[PDB]
Amino acid sequence: GAQDGKETTTIRLINQTYFNVKNIKVTWNDGKEQTVNTLGSHDSIDFSSDAGSVYKMDVTGTTQSGEKFTGHFKGLVGKDTRVFIELDENADVQVFIPQGEID
């Protein structure tokens, strides 16, 4: 019940891959999760996140070709988060992030 509570992060998904997706669960705490409608070929979406700060993100989505990826993270910082959905290993769908303190 805030009215000046512009005191929350944003999360911003980018589908930097060779498909479209239609079913992204994202999590950004223990118990803060929501779902995202669709993300075009190389498209992007951003949405509000119900906490002022965040260090983890546990994502779970699926491709056009019914192929399921995750993004298991616990090393976030800062007052925003992005997601670079990309491919690796065999052009299999991974998830990546533009992190900074990752040493």
Side-chain angles (χ1 to χ4, degrees):
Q3 300 202 98
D4 191 78
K6 40 58 184 289
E7 297 170 13
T8 22
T9 53
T10 323
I11 290 159
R12 194 266 273 231
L13 283 274
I14 315 90
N15 187 27
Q16 307 195 270
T17 66
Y18 66 5
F19 50 63
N20 174 92
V21 299
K22 62 262 168 69
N23 45 220
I24 320 178
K25 259 265 70 151
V26 316
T27 322
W28 68 95
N29 220 268
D30 285 335
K32 244 73 239 184
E33 55 281 324
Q34 74 93 60
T35 61
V36 206
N37 183 34
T38 313
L39 210 52
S41 312
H42 262 261
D43 218 316
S44 41
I45 173 69
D46 29 81
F47 45 91
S48 226
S49 357
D50 250 286
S53 38
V54 44
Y55 46 60
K56 72 182 291 182
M57 170 169 281
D58 273 278
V59 319
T60 148
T62 313
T63 71
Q64 190 142 261
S65 293
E67 229 290 80
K68 185 183 172 66
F69 53 86
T70 53
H72 292 292
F73 308 108
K74 262 200 64 171
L76 309 178
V77 288
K79 204 201 132 181
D80 52 272
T81 324
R82 289 180 282 154
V83 183
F84 297 166
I85 309 178
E86 301 210 78
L87 314 174
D88 192 23
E89 305 195 35
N90 312 287
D92 296 323
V93 193
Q94 310 320 303
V95 180
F96 195 75
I97 24 177
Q99 301 314 114
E101 70 162 47
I102 179 152
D103 115 95

